[PDB]
Amino acid sequence: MIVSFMVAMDENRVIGKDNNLPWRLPSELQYVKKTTMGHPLIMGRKNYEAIGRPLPGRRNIIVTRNEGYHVEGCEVAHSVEEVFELCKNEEEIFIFGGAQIYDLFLPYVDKLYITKIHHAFEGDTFFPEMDMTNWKEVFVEKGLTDEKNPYTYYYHVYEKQQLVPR
């Protein structure tokens, strides 16, 4: 199973301001929708609640310690192992965020879809630092910038840097 991080962040790795997107880039979201069509979306409860609704055309799986937590049109998992069990036949899952959620899935991640927005917003949560030397870029693309998507941004995808034996 391919464990993938899906993330949008600013020049300082900001991913949230008071559980909200500091930016409004509809085209970026259309990218997320396109890229994740037909795969599980893995998210923390806070992230989910900030989104506000089941996002369709895909298994929304919310991750929380809270055993009583339920929401209609979604699944709830209480641990990483619970997520893997739920997704056992899945070919690729997308960790959708909550800084802590990315941390939980960090030792299993195979693939990074990162949108970098060229700006400094005001934020309170951050995409955790990562050593990118174990990572190799395989695709890049300048996102659409216009009246509705004010900022300049780029889609990046990374896979594992393969080591060459001594």
Residue 36 in tokens: 């994740």
* Residue 11 binds to Ca ion (criterion: CB under 5 A): no
Q: Which stretch binds ligand 31I (CB under 6 A): 53-61, 62-70, 72-80, 128-136?
A: 53-61
20 is in an annotated binding site: yes
10 is in an annotated binding site: no
User: Are the C-beta atoms of residues 158 and 5 closer than 8 Å to each other?
Assistant: no
DSSP state of 78: S
Q: Which stretch binds ligand 31I (CB under 6 A): 1-9, 116-124, 134-142, 156-164?
A: 1-9
Residue 18 in tokens: 């008071």
Residue 10 in tokens: 């600013």
CA distance 40 to 97: 13
User: What DSSP line would sit under 86-124, residue for residue?
Assistant: HTTT-SEEEEEE-HHHHHHHTTT--EEEEEEESS----S
CA distance 68 to 159: 37
Q: Point out which residues pair with 128 in neighbouring strands.
A: none
53 is in an annotated binding site: no
Residue 25 or 63: the one with the smaller Cβ distance to Cl ion is: 63
Which entry of Cl ion, Ca ion, ligand 31I, none binds 110, CB below 5 to 8 A by partner kind? Ca ion
CA distance 139 to 75: 32
Report 2-31 residues binding ligand 31I (CB under 6 A): 6-8, 16, 20-21, 28-30
**Beta pairing class for 111-117 and 92-97:** unpaired
Q: Which stretch binds Ca ion (CB under 5 A): 16-24, 59-67, 84-92, 104-112?
A: 104-112
Which entry of Ca ion, Cl ion, ligand 31I, none binds 98, CB below 5 to 8 A by partner kind? Cl ion
Interacting residues with ligand 31I (CB under 6 A):
6-8, 16, 20-21, 28-30, 32-33, 50-51, 55-57, 96-97, 115
Interacting residues with Ca ion (CB under 5 A):
108, 110
Q: Which residues are annotated as a binding site for NADPH?
A: 8, 15, 19-20, 45-47, 64-66, 98-101, 125
